[PDB]
Amino acid sequence: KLVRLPGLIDVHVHLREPGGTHKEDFASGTAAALAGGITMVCAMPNTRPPIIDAPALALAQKLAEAGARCDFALFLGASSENAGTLGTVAGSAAGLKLYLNETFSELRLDSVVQWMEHFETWPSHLPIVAHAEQQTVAAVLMVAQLTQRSVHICHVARKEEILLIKAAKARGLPVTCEVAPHHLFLSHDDLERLGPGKGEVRPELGSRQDVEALWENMAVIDCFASDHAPHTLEEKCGSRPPPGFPGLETMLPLLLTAVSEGRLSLDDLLQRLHHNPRRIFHLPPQEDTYVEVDLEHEWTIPSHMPFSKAHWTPFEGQKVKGTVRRVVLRGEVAYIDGQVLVPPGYGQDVRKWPQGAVPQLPP
């Protein structure tokens, strides 16, 4: 007996096109998404060229329209030069991405004043998300308050961060957050097995206490999102390993395992991979779209999943229970038992749908 789920949404993926297509491209990354029960993705802007201006966004839109197999929205990225220049294209993006710490990214800002400038100039009704670790979470929350708007915190990974956000929510501040599966299912205990190259990720893997704190504070977590960050094994194992884990194909099975163990409910999962992503980012429904999962199937994660060009996974050897059997996207069978059945280009930019524009007051 299969369980029918709505089309799940991952608001944080790196699909590497343009410019890093040996790591992943729209076609392979969205195949990975479908195999993971995800029918809509929001792609980050730290590509080459990075998506920090209108011409780069135009290019990325066309590449995505030609290559994506599931539906998508594309983030714009904040830079040290583009505040006040994105107004005409802002509404066509998933939101604005701020990179506020060192990581795989034309996009660290030099000064909190540049963060302020972005918060002041980006349209007030559109989403802003931030890579903001440790004290940076408090700092960007301060900027959001000074500019009297909301902010969404990407991949919360630490007890420190989730408790800060918890305190902010208790004060009624407009902040939401997401957590990635590696920060729920891996910790320092796994670094011996992974090694120092494979183990590189930002935010870094946390202690057992960090992991336990995220679970204990599940009520504070608005979304799950993979931070799918594919790099090849050669890159991960080489002399300057880039941070990041692939995760689209493993996220839902890991979380289904947790549901089966009573660690969270099916509803808790659906709030975090469907309803809250929709409402935070004003993402439209997908008609005739659903995912069928088998909650009984026990399997062990192999050394690589079938679709991501990363061709490795940090979850190798973990025992999971739950698998994606079928995905239907807008009335077409998109995935069945290991086979993707929609071609590159089937996917659409949801921000171009009438129902996918973010509502705003007449300007």
Ligand X SMILES: NC(=O)N[C@@H](CC(=O)O)C(=O)O
Positions marked active-site: 227
What is the C-alpha separation between 258 and 96, in angstroms, rounded?
A: 32
Residue numbers at the binding site for ligand X (CB under 6 A): 14, 46, 103-105, 131, 201-202, 227, 229, 243-244
Map residues 44-63 to x or -, x wherever contact with a second copy holds by CB under 8 A: --------------------
243 is in an annotated binding site: yes
Q: Which residues contact 271 (CB under 8 A, 6 or more apart)?
A: none
Interacting positions 136-175 with a second copy (CB under 8 A)? 136-143, 145-146, 159-160, 163-164, 167-168, 171
Q: How many helices (H) and strands (E) does the chain have?
A: 12, 14
- The two tokens of residue 81 are 């030069």
State the nearest-atom distance from the C-beta of 111 to a second copy, in Å. 4
Q: Does 208 bind a second copy (CB under 8 A)?
A: no
Interacting positions 83-102 with a second copy (CB under 8 A)? 100
State the nearest-atom distance from the C-beta of 174 to ligand X, in Å. 23
Q: Which residues of 282-296 are buried (b: 16+ CB within 10 A; e: fewer)?
A: bbbebeebbbbbbee
Q: Which residues contact 339 (CB under 8 A, 6 or more apart)?
A: none
237 binds, options ligand X, Zn ion, a second copy, none, Cβ within 5 to 8 A by partner type: none
Q: Does 111 bind a second copy (CB under 8 A)?
A: yes
47 in Cβ contact with 323 (< 8 Å)? no
Q: Which stretch binds a second copy (CB under 8 A): 40-48, 68-76, 105-113, 311-319?
A: 105-113
Helix-strand-coil percent breakdown of the chain, rounded to 5? 35, 20, 45
244 binds, options Zn ion, a second copy, ligand X, none, Cβ within 5 to 8 A by partner type: ligand X
154 is in an annotated binding site: yes
Residue 224: count other Cβ atoms within 10 Å of its Cβ: 27
152 binds, options ligand X, Zn ion, a second copy, none, Cβ within 5 to 8 A by partner type: none
231 is in an annotated binding site: yes
